[PDB]
Write an enzyme that holds these catalytic residues in place. Structure first.
Site, PDB file in Angstrom:
ATOM      1  N   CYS A 115      -1.328   3.823  -0.860  1.00 48.77           N
ATOM      2  CA  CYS A 115      -1.974   4.246  -2.101  1.00 48.77           C
ATOM      3  C   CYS A 115      -2.249   3.090  -3.056  1.00 48.77           C
ATOM      4  O   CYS A 115      -3.405   2.944  -3.490  1.00 48.77           O
ATOM      5  CB  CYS A 115      -1.136   5.338  -2.776  1.00 48.77           C
ATOM      6  SG  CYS A 115      -0.585   6.649  -1.674  1.00 48.77           S
ATOM      7  N   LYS A 145       0.311  19.951  -4.378  1.00 53.87           N
ATOM      8  CA  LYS A 145      -0.059  19.524  -3.039  1.00 53.87           C
ATOM      9  C   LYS A 145      -0.199  20.725  -2.115  1.00 53.87           C
ATOM     10  O   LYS A 145       0.344  21.804  -2.368  1.00 53.87           O
ATOM     11  CB  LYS A 145       0.962  18.543  -2.455  1.00 53.87           C
ATOM     12  CG  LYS A 145       2.298  19.173  -2.101  1.00 53.87           C
ATOM     13  CD  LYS A 145       3.276  18.131  -1.578  1.00 53.87           C
ATOM     14  CE  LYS A 145       4.718  18.610  -1.684  1.00 53.87           C
ATOM     15  NZ  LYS A 145       5.687  17.585  -1.198  1.00 53.87           N
ATOM     16  N   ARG A 170       9.632   2.264   6.090  1.00 59.22           N
ATOM     17  CA  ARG A 170      10.589   2.877   5.182  1.00 59.22           C
ATOM     18  C   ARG A 170      11.999   2.689   5.716  1.00 59.22           C
ATOM     19  O   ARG A 170      12.236   2.806   6.922  1.00 59.22           O
ATOM     20  CB  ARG A 170      10.297   4.369   4.984  1.00 59.22           C
ATOM     21  CG  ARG A 170       9.078   4.643   4.121  1.00 59.22           C
ATOM     22  CD  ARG A 170       8.684   6.109   4.159  1.00 59.22           C
ATOM     23  NE  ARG A 170       7.261   6.290   3.896  1.00 59.22           N
ATOM     24  CZ  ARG A 170       6.673   7.465   3.721  1.00 59.22           C
ATOM     25  NH1 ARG A 170       7.358   8.596   3.774  1.00 59.22           N
ATOM     26  NH2 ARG A 170       5.364   7.507   3.488  1.00 59.22           N
ATOM     27  N   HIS A 192      -4.677  12.220  -2.200  1.00 58.50           N
ATOM     28  CA  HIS A 192      -3.999  11.610  -1.064  1.00 58.50           C
ATOM     29  C   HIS A 192      -4.061  12.564   0.123  1.00 58.50           C
ATOM     30  O   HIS A 192      -3.727  13.746  -0.002  1.00 58.50           O
ATOM     31  CB  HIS A 192      -2.548  11.269  -1.412  1.00 58.50           C
ATOM     32  CG  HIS A 192      -2.392  10.487  -2.681  1.00 58.50           C
ATOM     33  ND1 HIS A 192      -1.728   9.280  -2.730  1.00 58.50           N
ATOM     34  CD2 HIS A 192      -2.807  10.737  -3.947  1.00 58.50           C
ATOM     35  CE1 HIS A 192      -1.743   8.820  -3.967  1.00 58.50           C
ATOM     36  NE2 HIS A 192      -2.391   9.684  -4.726  1.00 58.50           N
ATOM     37  N   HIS A 223      -7.681   8.044   0.883  1.00 55.76           N
ATOM     38  CA  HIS A 223      -7.662   8.407  -0.527  1.00 55.76           C
ATOM     39  C   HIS A 223      -9.091   8.591  -1.013  1.00 55.76           C
ATOM     40  O   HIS A 223      -9.977   7.803  -0.669  1.00 55.76           O
ATOM     41  CB  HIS A 223      -6.947   7.348  -1.377  1.00 55.76           C
ATOM     42  CG  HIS A 223      -5.491   7.204  -1.062  1.00 55.76           C
ATOM     43  ND1 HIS A 223      -5.027   6.430  -0.021  1.00 55.76           N
ATOM     44  CD2 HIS A 223      -4.395   7.737  -1.652  1.00 55.76           C
ATOM     45  CE1 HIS A 223      -3.708   6.491   0.017  1.00 55.76           C
ATOM     46  NE2 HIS A 223      -3.300   7.277  -0.963  1.00 55.76           N
TER      47      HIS A 223
HETATM   48 ZN   LIG Z   1      -1.393   8.506  -0.595  1.00 52.12          ZN
END
Ligand SMILES: [Zn+2]
Ligand SMILES: O=C(N[C@H](C(=O)O)[C@H](O)Cc1ccc([N+](=O)[O-])cc1)c1cccc(O)c1O
Ligand SMILES: O=C(N[C@H](C(=O)O)[C@H](O)Cc1ccc([N+](=O)[O-])cc1)c1cccc(O)c1O
Ligand SMILES: [Zn+2]
Lengths: 400, 400
Positions: free
Chosen positions: B93, B224, B122, B270, B144
């Site tokens: 992002c 979302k 991660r 996103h 995006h």
């Molecule tokens: Zn994103």
């Protein structure tokens, strides 16, 4: 002829202080990078290479087994997780050995060619960073060949022929070849170094490559061949490298069962033809001054109308060329035709297609190159097939 | 039906303690991964996304501007370079916002659809790692979209269509959708959240998609939509996510010139269909139990001889299929025909061509499927045509 200026003008890439030496690939620039991926991949199929992908970081314990940690720890990016140190890989060689170690290998399996478009990261000094050519994050057209001592000379022959095959595609014909001999501090006996340097020397003889020694410049684990190409401005660029290795496969416990049913350590050949592709794109940008070959151009064809009486004739032909696998765009703006042509000539679009009612009724297209030559009105199907032949053959020169 | 067990059997990938939660893709497994890239890129062209490439790491100072550092500092790998701290990106992002910030943007440039095969890392707890499905390093089919508030409904509609288009390709038809409403702590007024959740709710209602309210489960910067697909074993797999963001573009100084000439902050959506591509390959491996569709199979055709009197006919036939873009290899070994066929049936090879003296003279091939069905001896050009159609159409089913 400065790739940093041309990169911003053609909207290919940009860099910023929040990520020094790391490239933001825009759509047009990423198109050029992906086309290099296809061109290299077409060579891997022809030369029978496998393509693999290794993880971006491994345990620092693994990197100590290779002996590179003692040498190049400062150039490595290190991170931590659950009381373990991990290194972002600056090379693909240990990863490829790990794929090789999975499942018992035999002499039947050698030679084994293993290529990767591996992203590598090096903690390069920030003051040395320059555009696309000295960066911290780069992708390498990397490969590693595992073979026997008998297969060394033939495997290097393939690497040498691969180097001249790829360079001649981009018009690079003046190539200077240097062989690096044994350094002061090295491993292995003098006898092993004698045949290792001979194998590189012989392989260049069987190809009629005149070369030149770089005395004492070789790595501590084997000699190498370094290829240097010269651009249209006679500036040397060191891109190709073929590096023998008699240390890493043993350090990482790579082995195979030989003809005599005894366990043997294979020989590793490290080879890269384009080196850093981000760097190579920088060379191509300045070698062509933005006038990329049609197969490499971000936008290959732009189709324009004189008036609105042809807007969907352009739209149909844009679809027709798109179904031919040609990166084509349409410019139906309410602007003068000369303004449109200068717009896309500035963007270095290889071909401009102009459609008037003269060509709409006859099912033809007026064709103009970015250089300025007007090729007249020809059949759309004939134009499409000519465009395909130029792209598929990766022709340096356009029509006429 | 274990992706890990099938992965080792078919030589797709491997993992080791030197890089926990990280995947070494072998040649056969990297073929499957690259084919999904082609499929995704085919959808990107259809839905008109830009494909970009962001840097693998960025300054931690920027990550503090996004507000993600305060909440997710424990999940980020960090490194040092000349007394500066850099985080390996766990998401694409901020990188896409940086590309969007280069060059002033007008309202005519929106909606701006920007996709990337981002490599995100991660610091997952090693005790939670599981094969291809819970990993530390992964690739995301990321994108995006920058648009105005009036353009949210139309863009979310496109994301929803693309979610079902891609799932239907793999045979996933039972999909469960949930909408995460405002959380206890959030940014923006009620009216902004009222409009934002309504846009997601209306879009899901227009597409006649039954959805369950996940009350309070939304992020602090927007609601979302999450898509969960059910496999042939009726197990739930949460892959698709559509997140509205009203915080990051303002935090990262993203702006555009509107039709009223007042500079406004755009809205970010996103979007990811498959989620982690490593995870999706794991689901696909267990879904098909290794019996991949012909367009995903690492090796699509194996051509074999009866005696040595047909080794040449197989060889030209293998090359002829190779020129047709078909992943084909020849098995000319000195083994019984039953032994050869089992060898490639175990490898889940979709099609197996057999050439005796009968078909060499007639220019045909005896064709057998991995299910065990003989299809007789048909013309070589006819089977090539049918193989291409099955590959081009991405057919789950085989011939007949
Ligand atoms: Zn994103
Ligand atoms: O030249 C190569 N290796 C050399 C030996 O093998 C060694 O890798 C040199 C080196 C590694 C890392 C750093 N660094 O700054 O972290 C500097 C220098 C090489 C060239 C092309 C392809 C490959 O896979 C190759 O391995
Ligand atoms: O779900 C998404 N974003 C959410 C907001 O935006 C936020 O990204 C959630 C998050 C979870 C875990 C971590 N983490 O560091 O473990 C960071 C962020 C998302 C979905 C599809 C594509 C994308 O690029 C998306 O960003
Ligand atoms: Zn190497």
């Amino acid at each position: 002829r400065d790739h940093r200026k041309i990169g911003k003008q053609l909207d290919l890439y940009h860099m910023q202080e929040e990520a020094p030496g790391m490239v933001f690939w825009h759509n047009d620039g990423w198109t050029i990078f992906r086309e290099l991926e296809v061109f290299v991949r077409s060579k891997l199929k022809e030369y029978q290479y496998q393509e693999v992908k290794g993880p971006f970081m491994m345990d620092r314990v693994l990197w100590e087994k290779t002996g590179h940690w003692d040498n190049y720890k400062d150039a490595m990016f290190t991170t931590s997780s659950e009381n373990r140190e991990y290194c972002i890989k600056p090379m693909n060689c240990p990863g490829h050995v790990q794929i090789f170690n999975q499942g018992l290998k035999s002499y039947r399996d050698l030679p084994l060619r293993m290529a990767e478009f591996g992203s590598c990261h090096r903690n390069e000094p920030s003051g040395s960073l320059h555009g696309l050519m000295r960066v911290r994050g780069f992708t390498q057209d990397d490969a590693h060949i595992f073979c026997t001592e008998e297969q060394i000379r033939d495997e290097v022959n393939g690497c040498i022929r691969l180097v001249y095959d790829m360079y001649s595609t981009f018009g690079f014909e003046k190539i200077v070849v240097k062989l690096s001999t044994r350094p002061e501090k090295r491993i292995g006996s003098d006898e092993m170094w004698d045949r290792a340097e001979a194998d590189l020397a012989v392989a260049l003889e069987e190809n009629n490559i005149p070369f030149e020694y770089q005395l004492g410049e070789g790595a501590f684990y084997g000699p190498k061949i370094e290829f240097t190409l010269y651009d249209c401005l006679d500036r040397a660029w060191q891109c190709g490298t073929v590096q023998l290795d008699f240390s890493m496969p043993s350090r990482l416990s790579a082995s195979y069962v030989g003809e005599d049913n005894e366990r043997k350590v294979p020989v590793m050949i490290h080879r890269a033809i384009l080196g850093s592709m981000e760097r190579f794109i920088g060379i191509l940008t300045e070698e062509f001054a933005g006038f990329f070959p049609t197969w490499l151009a971000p936008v290959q064809v732009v189709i324009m109308n004189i008036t609105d009486s042809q807007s969907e004739y352009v739209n149909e032909l844009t679809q027709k060329l798109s179904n031919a696998g040609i990166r084509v765009k349409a410019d139906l703006r309410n602007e003068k035709i000369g303004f449109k042509i200068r717009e896309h000539t500035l963007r270095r679009v290889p071909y401009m297609l102009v459609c008037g009612d003269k060509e709409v009724e006859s099912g033809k297209v007026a064709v103009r190159t970015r250089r300025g030559k007007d090729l007249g009105s020809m059949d759309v199907n004939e134009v499409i097939e000519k465009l395909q032949q130029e792209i598929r053959s990766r022709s340096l020169k356009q029509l006429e």
